[PDB]
């Protein structure tokens, strides 16, 4: 936003939004994988119980 | 004078105020578009060489 014009800065501001924004979407996928298998371990630690 | 083609002047700028009004003052530089930097913003942005 200090150095390109706003007619051209849309494009180069887009392709950068777009590749952070898919980071996030990925961190939150691995997140319900590891959360689903640890639910799996505490049903057979509470059957442990 | 201006040297020919192959035999291209190179200058030295170096710890002086630039102001980019005075180059746009000239009435035939209908061929001024810029690629790094829009043409616009030249006047607060600091270089190194």
Redesign the interface.
């Known amino acids: 936003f200090?150095?390109?014009?706003k007619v051209?800065a849309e494009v180069q501001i887009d392709r950068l939004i777009t590749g952070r924004l898919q980071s996030l979407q990925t961190y939150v996928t691995q997140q319900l994988i590891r959360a689903a298998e640890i639910r799996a371990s505490a049903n057979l630690a509470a059957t442990k119980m | 004078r201006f040297a020919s083609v192959y035999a291209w002047n190179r200058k030295r700028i170096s710890n002086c105020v630039a102001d980019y009004s005075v180059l746009y003052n000239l009435a035939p530089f209908f061929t001024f578009k810029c690629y790094?930097?829009?043409p616009?913003?030249l006047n607060?942005?600091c270089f190194t060489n």
């Open positions: 200090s150095r390109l014009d051209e | 790094g930097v829009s616009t913003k607060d942005l």
